[PDB]
Amino acid sequence: ATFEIVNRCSYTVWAAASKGDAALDAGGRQLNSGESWTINVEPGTKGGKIWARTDCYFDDSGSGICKTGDCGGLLRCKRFGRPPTTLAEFSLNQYGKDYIDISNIKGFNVPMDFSPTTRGCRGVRCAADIVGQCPAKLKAPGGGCNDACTVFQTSEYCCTTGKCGPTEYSRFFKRLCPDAFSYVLDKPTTVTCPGSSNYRVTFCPT
C-alpha cells in the first residue's frame, strides 16, 4: 500500500513509520512545511503506526533526539516513539479488510488527518488544539499533551487488568477528538476500508 505523508504544519516535522519491531519503508524522514513523503507499506502489515516527531536534532549518521515521538534517538525509526504522539494506526489486508484509526492513547503532539486516497471508506481526523487546552498535569514540557497512562502509570489509566473505564483525562481527549481512541477500551473508532487501500496522513490538516 502507498501512504503519502504530508506535512501541512508551518513547522518541520520528522515523520516516522514503524510496526514496532521494524521500520516501515525508510522509517523516518524530515518533512519541511509542505513536503510530502511517499512510502510503501508491505501488504499484510499488522500494527503499523505513523507519527510526527517535533524539535529533532540529528547528526549526519541519523542519530539524535526529538522532543516528541523520539524512537530511540534515530532518524529512521525501527521502534515506536516516546509519547506524546498522535498516532495513525493501521493493519492492512486482514481478512480482506484494512483497518485504520487515529489514537490519542499515547497522547497528542501534532494534529492529524488519516484518509484513504482510494475509494470505499472515510477518513478520521484529530485536529483540535489539544496541546493548547491540555490539562496542566498532562502537559509535556517538550511539547505535546501526554496521556494519563504515561504520566501516572496506574492500572486504571493503563487498563492493565483489561478492565478500566473512561477517566477525566480520557474524556478530555475524547471531547476534543471524538474520532480518535482516548483510552484502551474506548468504543472503537476504527474505520474499515477495502483491503489494499492507499492512504494519506496529513499533519496539521486545517
Numbering used by the authors: 1 to 206
Please, what does the article write about this entry?
In many instances, a significantly higher yield of indexed lattices per chip is desired. The sample layer is sealed between the two SOS films by clamping them together against an M42x1 O-ring. The large SOS chip has also been used at the ID29 SMX endstation, both to collect data for model systems and with bona fide samples. Excellent high-resolution data can be obtained (the statistics of a thaumatin dataset are given in Tables S4 and S5 of the supporting information). We typically use 2.5–3 µm-thick Etnom sheets for crystals in aqueous solutions and 6 µm-thick Mylar sheets for crystals in LCP. To prevent sample settling yet allow leeway in adjusting the crystal slurry layer thickness, we often add 1.5–2% hy­droxy­ethyl cellulose to the mother liquor. Our layers of crystalline slurries are typically 20–30 µm thick. SOS chips are unique in their cost effectiveness and in their ease and versatility of use with crystals of both soluble and membrane proteins, as grown in both low-viscosity (aqueous solutions) and high-viscosity media (LCP).
